[PDB]
Design a protein around this ligand. Structure first.
Ligand SMILES: Cc1ccc(-c2cc(C(F)(F)F)nn2-c2ccc(S(N)(=O)=O)cc2)cc1
Ligand SMILES: [Zn+2]
Length: 256
């Protein structure tokens, strides 16, 4: 029954998921003066023009836009990555207030939200196998700040009323995730983990330096979602972020 509450939130996860205290947990604080520029890094390749979204789901923890990953349609390559990683889903983490909500922090700065575009290494054939491998996943993380609206997010916002509560889903076809990306693909990268249970240490993190701007209205609609099931006492889906974890034996590399 893990969650983000006082009795089941991040500080409790290690009891069911002891890897929570592991050597390469995420998220982390990105200390920008200590991150090392790596000329080894090759440019990141985000090829999302053939993405096929399927559905959107409230899973009690966040909302998730799921894609058809049965062919090489939307993929991430280059950067720190070897090979091809297929987009399977994206989701967000966000706050109760504009001053918190991201998982990663930048020089301890918290953003209003963070977008995770989740990809799996096609060398492992499926996502479930990939999560058992140290190089199984690549998650592209993109910060959200509140300011101007992001037009490409609006189709997501407008379907949230149909998936208010835990377990609700809806058709969500022809959504183009390119509309969620900032101009710059300058990034930080480090080896880490899933930021929710099971907290598996399978992720190459790629966190973009440039945030996207979303409007207050757009994020306010995120905060009207519910963690609870239909006909249960309302618990607003807010502050579904894990705090920064110890960096331990890792170096964050910068592409710029
Ligand atoms: C809609 C949806 C949501 C989650 C999952 C999923 C499953 C699993 C696992 F490991 F159990 F298989 N993790 N995991 C998952 C994926 C990404 C992250 S994150 N926040 O690090 O990007 C954290 C957990 C799949 C689909
Ligand atoms: Zn996430």
């Amino acid at each position: 029954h893990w969650g983000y509450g006082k009795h089941n939130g991040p500080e409790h996860w290690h009891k069911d998921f002891p890897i929570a205290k592991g050597e390469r947990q995420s998220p982390v604080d990105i200390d920008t003066h200590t991150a090392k520029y790596d000329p080894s890094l090759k440019p990141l390749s985000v090829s999302y023009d053939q993405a096929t979204s399927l559905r959107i789901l409230n899973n009690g923890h966040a909302f998730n836009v799921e894609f058809d990953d049965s062919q090489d349609k939307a993929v991430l390559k280059g950067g720190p990555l070897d090979g091809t990683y297929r987009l399977i889903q994206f989701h967000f983490h966000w706050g109760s207030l504009d001053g918190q909500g991201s998982e990663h922090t930048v020089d301890k700065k918290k953003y209003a939200a963070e977008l995770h575009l989740v990809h799996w290494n096609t060398k492992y054939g499926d996502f479930g196998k990939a999560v058992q491998q140290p190089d199984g996943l690549a998650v592209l993380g993109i910060f959200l700040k509140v300011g101007s609206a992001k037009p490409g997010l609006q189709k997501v916002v407008d379907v949230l009323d149909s998936i208010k509560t835990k377990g609700k889903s809806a058709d969500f076809t022809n959504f183009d995730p390119r509309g969620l990306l900032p101009e710059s693909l300058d990034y930080w990268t480090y080896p880490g983990s899933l930021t929710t249970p099971p907290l598996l240490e399978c992720v190459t993190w790629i966190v973009l330096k440039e945030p996207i701007s979303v409007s207050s209205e757009q994020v306010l609609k995120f905060r009207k979602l519910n963690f609870n099931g239909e006909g249960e006492p309302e618990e607003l889906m807010v502050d579904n972020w894990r705090p920064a974890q110890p960096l331990k034996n890792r170096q964050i590399k910068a592409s710029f």
